[model samples]
Target: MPHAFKPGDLVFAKMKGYPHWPARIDDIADGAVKPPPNKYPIFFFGTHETAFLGPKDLFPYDKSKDKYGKPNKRKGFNEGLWEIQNNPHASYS
Candidate 1:
């Protein structure tokens, strides 16, 4: 399936055996490199306290859930490491 990202979308790395990272999509691949459908060239920031450009499988971030596990309309950060704790895509050990 094709990646479900568009420019300016906020996403977080679905880390596996690695640390959690947050970033946003700045641009999409132009099909010149023929990258995998889910692997799009992304221009983002905050993963390393600097800007990055690479291809990675990413998951969308929804700030609709408050830290207290209640519905919240105010936008802010997502859960910490626990965010992906129960996610099948997350690597836990």
Candidate 2:
């Protein structure tokens, strides 16, 4: 959750089957759903797809810059992180 991922700002977003791609934090929101229920609705800059995710699912572009940077440039997801994030943690950077 570094940087508080504010709305309208372009950054990276992740899902199960894609590289963290350019996306906008479409809204600043919350709901009485579940832990990490407060979500970030995102739009993939690479396509017309969209989904609801949390800040843990985001990454800054420059953080992934090597030529072989993103393995998800074509893949599923990281189970380690999926479980780690489900634990609900955040700290400012």
Candidate 3:
């Protein structure tokens, strides 16, 4: 529960048996929730992994809130639930 995670910070997580993916902090944001919450942005070293770039790629922007403060009520679609939405890909430069 540090103030926040900034880019270049090392992060490790296990998802579907993938451990120590060596993700690099790319961005952090408090998405558009009823009251925005801090979410971290991360990027992986390879493909077929969790999004390296996307709204879903973001993580807990703020932890003081009961919820991520997301506006959606869909099942499992909360503030930090954007990752589960399987949102179509888009390119930004």
Candidate 4:
């Protein structure tokens, strides 16, 4: 599927195996994100730091039905879906 993102778009990416490592899409992968010829779009993330984080990383959008139990694409007042932000717990200026 085509990604729902462009540069500087605030995108929330789902993460696994960490209670607080859900990542926010800081930099959407450019041409380099996908290998030449054929590949999927991906995101290079920031914040929600974790050891699993990879530079020049690539992540395909979750298309499987099992990709559930997470927050909305844009989280509302509900609680199950946690927000992934540059400063999730930090005070904004």
| Highest lDDT scorer | 2
lDDT tens string, model 2, 1-93?
456666665556767865666555554337633324667666555353457888778775456434213334232223323322342122111
What residue runs in model 2 are displaced by over 4 Å at the alpha carbon?
Answer: 28-36, 65-93
Q: What lDDT tens digits, residue by residue, belong to model 1 across residues 1-93?
A: 555566666555433443334445554347644435555444323222223333454655554223323322323223332333333233212
Candidate 2 lDDT trough over 10 residues, lowest sum: 84-93
Each candidate: RMSD to true structure? 11.6, 11.5, 13.8, 9.4
Pairs that collide in candidate 2 are none
TM-score of each: 0.38, 0.50, 0.33, 0.25
Specify the highest-TM-score model's number.
Answer: 2
Query: What's the distance in Å from true for residue 25, model 4?
Result: 1.5
Ranked candidates (lDDT, high to low): 2, 1, 3, 4
- Overall local distance difference test of candidate 2: 0.50
- Candidate 3 per-residue C-alpha lDDT over 1-93 given as tens digits, one digit per residue, 9 for 90 to 100: 454555655443223433333344554345722213544444443332334432333334233123333344433223233332232121111
Q: Candidate 1: global Cα-lDDT?
A: 0.41
Candidate 3: RMSD to truth: 13.8
Clashing pairs in 3: 38-60, 38-61, 38-62, 39-59, 39-60, 39-61, 40-59
Q: List candidate 4 stretches off by more than 4 Å.
A: 1-21, 28-47, 50-66, 70-80, 84-93
Count steric clashes of candidate 4.
1
TM-score of 1: 0.38
Q: In model 3, state the lDDT of residue 47.
A: 33
CA lDDT scores, all candidates in order: 0.41, 0.50, 0.37, 0.33
